[PDB]
Amino acid sequence: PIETVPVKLKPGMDGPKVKQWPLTEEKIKALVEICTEMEKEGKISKIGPENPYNTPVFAIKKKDSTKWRKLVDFRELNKRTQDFWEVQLGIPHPAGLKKKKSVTVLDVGDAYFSVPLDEDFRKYTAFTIPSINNETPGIRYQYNVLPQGWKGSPAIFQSSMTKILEPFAAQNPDIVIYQYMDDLYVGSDLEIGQHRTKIEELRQHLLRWGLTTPDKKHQKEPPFLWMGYELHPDKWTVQPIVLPEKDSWTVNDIQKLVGKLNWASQIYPGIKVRQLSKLLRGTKALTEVIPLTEEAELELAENREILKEPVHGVYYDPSKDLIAEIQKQGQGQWTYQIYQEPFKNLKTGKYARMRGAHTNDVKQLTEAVQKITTESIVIWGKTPKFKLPIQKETWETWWTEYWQATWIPEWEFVNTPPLVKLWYQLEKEPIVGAETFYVDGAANRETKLGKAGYVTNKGRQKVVPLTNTTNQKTELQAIYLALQDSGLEVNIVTDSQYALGIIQAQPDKSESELVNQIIEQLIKKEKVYLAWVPAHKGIGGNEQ
Amino acid sequence: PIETVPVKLKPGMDGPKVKQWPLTEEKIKALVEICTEMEKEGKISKIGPENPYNTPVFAIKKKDSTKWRKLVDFRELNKRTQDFWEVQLGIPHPAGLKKKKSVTVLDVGDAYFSVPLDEDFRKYTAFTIPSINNETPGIRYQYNVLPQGWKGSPAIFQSSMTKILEPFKKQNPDIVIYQYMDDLYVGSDLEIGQHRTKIEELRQHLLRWGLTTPMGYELHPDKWTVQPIVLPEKDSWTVNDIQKLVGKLNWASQIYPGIKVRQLSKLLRGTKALTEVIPLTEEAELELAENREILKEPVHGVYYDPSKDLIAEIQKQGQGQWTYQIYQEPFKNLKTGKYARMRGAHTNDVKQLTEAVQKITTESIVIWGKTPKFKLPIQKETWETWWTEYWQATWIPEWEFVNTPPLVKLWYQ
Numbered sequence: 022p023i024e025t026v027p028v029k030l031k032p033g034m035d036g037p038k039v040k041q042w043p044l045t046e047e048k049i050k051a052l053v054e055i056c057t058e059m060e061k062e063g064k065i066s067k068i069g070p071e072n073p074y075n076t077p078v079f080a081i082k083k084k085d086s087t088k089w090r091k092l093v094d095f096r097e098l099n100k101r102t103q104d105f106w107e108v109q110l111g112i113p114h115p116a117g118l119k120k121k122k123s124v125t126v127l128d129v130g131d132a133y134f135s136v137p138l139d140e141d142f143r144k145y146t147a148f149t150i151p152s153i154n155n156e157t158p159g160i161r162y163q164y165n166v167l168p169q170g171w172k173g174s175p176a177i178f179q180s181s182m183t184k185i186l187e188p189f190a191a192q193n194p195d196i197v198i199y200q201y202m203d204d205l206y207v208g209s210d211l212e213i214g215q216h217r218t219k220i221e222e223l224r225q226h227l228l229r230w231g232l233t234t235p236d237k238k239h240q241k242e243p244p245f246l247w248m249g250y251e252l253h254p255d256k257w258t259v260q261p262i263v264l265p266e267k268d269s270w271t272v273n274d275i276q277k278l279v280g281k282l283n284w285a286s287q288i289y290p291g292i293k294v295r296q297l298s299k300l301l302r303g304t305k306a307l308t309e310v311i312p313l314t315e316e317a318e319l320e321l322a323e324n325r326e327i328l329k330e331p332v333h334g335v336y337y338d339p340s341k342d343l344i345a346e347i348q349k350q351g352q353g354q355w356t357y358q359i360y361q362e363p364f365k366n367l368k369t370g371k372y373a374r375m376r377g378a379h380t381n382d383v384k385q386l387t388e389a390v391q392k393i394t395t396e397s398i399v400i401w402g403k404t405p406k407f408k409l410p411i412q413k414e415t416w417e418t419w420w421t422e423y424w425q426a427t428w429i430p431e432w433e434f435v436n437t438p439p440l441v442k443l444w445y446q447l448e449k450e451p452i453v454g455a456e457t458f459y460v461d462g463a464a465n466r467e468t469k470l471g472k473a474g475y476v477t478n479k480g481r482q483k484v485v486p487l488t489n490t491t492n493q494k495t496e497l498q499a500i501y502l503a504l505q506d507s508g509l510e511v512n513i514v515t516d517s518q519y520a521l522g523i524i525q526a527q528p529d530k531s532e533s534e535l536v537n538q539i540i541e542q543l544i545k546k547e548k549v550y551l552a553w554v555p556a557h558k559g560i561g562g563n564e565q
Numbered sequence: 566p567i568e569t570v571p572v573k574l575k576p577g578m579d580g581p582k583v584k585q586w587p588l589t590e591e592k593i594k595a596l597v598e599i600c601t602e603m604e605k606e607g608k609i610s611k612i613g614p615e616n617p618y619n620t621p622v623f624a625i626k627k628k629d630s631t632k633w634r635k636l637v638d639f640r641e642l643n644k645r646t647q648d649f650w651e652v653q654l655g656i657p658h659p660a661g662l663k664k665k666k667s668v669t670v671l672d673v674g675d676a677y678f679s680v681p682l683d684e685d686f687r688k689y690t691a692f693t694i695p696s697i698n699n700e701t702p703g704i705r706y707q708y709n710v711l712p713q714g715w716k717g718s719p720a721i722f723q724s725s726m727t728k729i730l731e732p733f734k735k736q737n738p739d740i741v742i743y744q745y746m747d748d749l750y751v752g753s754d755l756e757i758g759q760h761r762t763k764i765e766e767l768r769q770h771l772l773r774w775g776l777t778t779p780m781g782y783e784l785h786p787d788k789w790t791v792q793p794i795v796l797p798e799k800d801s802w803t804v805n806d807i808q809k810l811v812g813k814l815n816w817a818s819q820i821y822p823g824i825k826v827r828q829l830s831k832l833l834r835g836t837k838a839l840t841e842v843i844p845l846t847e848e849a850e851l852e853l854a855e856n857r858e859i860l861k862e863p864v865h866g867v868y869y870d871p872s873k874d875l876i877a878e879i880q881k882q883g884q885g886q887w888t889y890q891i892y893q894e895p896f897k898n899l900k901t902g903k904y905a906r907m908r909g910a911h912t913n914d915v916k917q918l919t920e921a922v923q924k925i926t927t928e929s930i931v932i933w934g935k936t937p938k939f940k941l942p943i944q945k946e947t948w949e950t951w952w953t954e955y956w957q958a959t960w961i962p963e964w965e966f967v968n969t970p971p972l973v974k975l976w977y978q
């Protein structure tokens with residue numbers, strides 16, 4: 022007696038008309054045996070010969086062939102059906118669940134077949150059981166309920182279940198029901214007996230609406246295995262992770278490995294995916310066998326070492342503060358733990374910067390804080406207090422002169438190394454009593470030979486030849502040369518807005534070794550003033 | 566008799582389907598309360614799975630008041646209703662509004678709540694009040710009445726608004742009144758005091774005609790213009806100063822063709838120390854004077870093309886100061902300006918950027934009758950997280966994010 026949900030076909034379309042020959046005999050007989058018992062239960066209805074629409078039908082088998090199974094391919098109907106609201110995009114995270122004295126899992130069978138389909142739409146679900154071919158007329162049917170694999174089934178079922186749950190949820194405001202597509206998860210602080218009573222009451226409720234529930238008392242017992250997790254009464258963790266050992270590794274195996282490691286990273290602190298992803302950098306040849314580097318194998322070894330012992334997360338207590346702490350792993354990788362308690366983590370995680378060839382520690386820290394803030398908002402509906410390995414003056418110095426707008430909430434300094442520091446700062450004004458290097462570099466797009474060099478005000482001049490370099494590379498190489506050949510205080514002048522761009526960003530690390538060496542030089546120096554001038558205006562420029 | 570004004574969408578366009586951003590428990594509670602009350606008043610109703618469409622919803626503060634306000638982001642639905650609100654039902658934008666010495670902004674939004682919305686159209690007003698940690702699928706509603714934030718609302722209500730404003734327009738023929746979204750912009754040349762008394766008169770007039778409105782918000786568009794580029798003024802000049810000068814001038818050579826750096830360039834010919842003080846020649850001073858003179862004149866052949874979208878770029882100048890340029894085409898500036906704020910700590914970057922975006926948007930409305938699409942100097946996720954905190958506006962401008970800018974400071978500053 023559930024109220025149906027009205028469904029339309031996409032505008033300008035009509036019900037699917039298809040023809041199905043296959044197959045054989047015993048499949049037809051089995052289809053008859055199934056459809057008779059289905060019609061008996063009112064789930065389907067036989068329609069007299071007319072000019073309706075039609076959908077293909079196949080018959081298959083599960084293990085222990087004593088069971089037979091019917092399958093209908095609805096793809097042709099699904100394309101013609103209207104769009105529906107999204108069922109759910111994601112699942113609740115165990116770290117965000119709250120402890121209840123008891124939790125019960127109920128699963129409803131024939132969930133879709135237990136809910137009615139909109140009447141006027143039913144004619145579009147029509148299919149045919151072909152008689153063995155003498156030309157004998159086939160058996161026409163249509164669905165009176167939500168067909169399996171139909172576009173609208175999960176959403177309509179979800180809303181139906183919600184409305185069915187409505188009157189029971191009103192009588193029991195102190196019990197908590199999570200709805201998943203085939204599942205209901207109930208929980209309470211009620212004494213065990215009262216809990217079993219309430220669960221049985223709910224079962225009878227659902228049964229009055231035609232929804233079956235497990236007859237064994239509560240069915241499954243904790244710990245529960247759900248969506249790759251393990252939910253124990255007082256704790257949560259992940260289902261056991263198996264890292265395979267092989268001589269040969271393809272792209273697929275590395276994909277699965279990175280998948281399992283990422284999945285593990287939520288509860289297990291310290292997991293590093295960098296090198297193993299570096300192996301997967303290539304978009305080429307999804308079946309390609311990839312040799313493992315030494316860094317990748319070391320990383321994998323460390324991950325195995327971490328995964329040796331089990332670890333588990335706790336549940337959420339709203340009465341207590343939400344704290345998040347971040348540590349730098351050093352390769353550009355960052356790890357973090359979210360906890361209300363010192364020895365217990367709600368969850369953990371990692372941030373890694375893939376985009377851009379140049380960055381610094383403070384920026385990455387900001388990005389991590391952003392990610393954690395977003396995740397916290399999603400899971401717990403609030404934002405954590407931060408414990409960060411950075412001095413306040415450092416952060417302030419950074420965000421004050423940074424071109425973007427950045428924001429961090431209330432945070433406190435943690436002394437745990439490695440600290441986040443500014444490894445150098447360019448002078449905002451030129452340096453008196455310092456040699457002025459006018460640097461320039463150039464290349465040839467064809468030969469890629471090129472050269473770098475400088476001319477100072479004291480008369481010093483140098484030109485170094487290069488091989489297999491580009492214009493940008495020489496433009497940076499010039500500045501590197503100036504840094505090498507000068508004192509602890511130097512004024513550099515470049516006509517390259519590129520090099521100025523890279524350097525003024527104040528990166529503490531880069532993929533390019535050249536930029537790294539330049540960083541080392543910048544750190545070694547006391548005072549460095551980099552300045553820019555328009556190229557080819559014939560003022561302070563080098564010509565080579 | 567009036568029934569409901571039918572609303573059609575441009576053929577080939579479906580309804581808006583947009584994700585709902587995760588919210589604080591606080592804001593979810595506020596939205597639940599608000600929507601419960603609205604459902605109680607018939608303004609909105611719950612909907613089923615057969616409604617695919619969704620529009621984002623947020624919780625902000627109204628007047629800065631301690632009570633929450635629901636803000637629906639209708640940008641997408643606006644883009645899809647453009648034929649309805651712009652071409653067919655459109656509202657003319659007065660070009661005399663920017664002339665007035667004082668402009669006050671009144672919130673007329675409540676007016677839309679009385680008028681019903683076309684049945685068949687209601688499914689496109691769908692929105693979702695989210696649940697924390699995906700505990701449940703969210704709460705689904707659709708509007709039974711003209712929603713605030715939709716451009717079709719003032720379009721439909723336009724006739725009623727005109728009729729209501731008619732007796733006031735006759736007693737005050739020199740007062741300019743424009744309607745954009747839920748806002749009524751009122752300009753005048755009156756003295757501030759008598760201007761405020763006039764605005765209060767309009768308040769009481771609208772009030773005794775049934776329209777409710779929630780020291781004051783006062784712009785002064787007569788002060789608004791395209792700011793001139795300023796060269797540094799120093800008693801003495803070093804090599805570095807002249808370098809910054811030649812660089813900046815060469816950059817300005819894009820905005821004006823008549824810039825000549827020759828005499829300034831010949832002064833730096835020898836390779837010297839940056840801190841070495843070098844005096845200017847007669848030709849150099851002549852050139853600096855000529856360039857300073859040509860720099861104060863407005864750009865030639867810069868006009869507003871109504872069809873093209875406005876583009877507002879913002880850059881951070883430090884010390885609580887930001888600069889912005891509104892333009893349709895590169896290096897042709899319809900508007901430029903600078904925004905600043907309170908000293909001490911009232912402040913932080915996101916707050917200033919938000920208030921700036923609102924200011925620029927309001928100016929843009931007063932001037933061209935439409936909002937610019939901003940290029941924002943901020944991390945996308947950061948802005949998406951924190952923008953609703955300081956947002957006092959009832960509309961939402963379009964925006965995107967830039968990782969690029971070279972700008973330094975001085976050039977726009």
Ligand SMILES: N#Cc1cc2c(Oc3ccccc3OCCn3ccc(=O)[nH]c3=O)cccn2c1
Pocket residue numbers: 113118119120121122123124125126197198199206207208209243245246247252253254255336
């Ligand atoms: N199979 C499975 C399964 C169980 C659950 C689930 O359990 C709860 C249901 C209602 C209220 C609190 C709950 O859990 C709170 C945490 N908890 C979980 C298990 C337990 O025994 N005790 C406990 O306090 C929630 C979400 C997805 N699920 C998937």
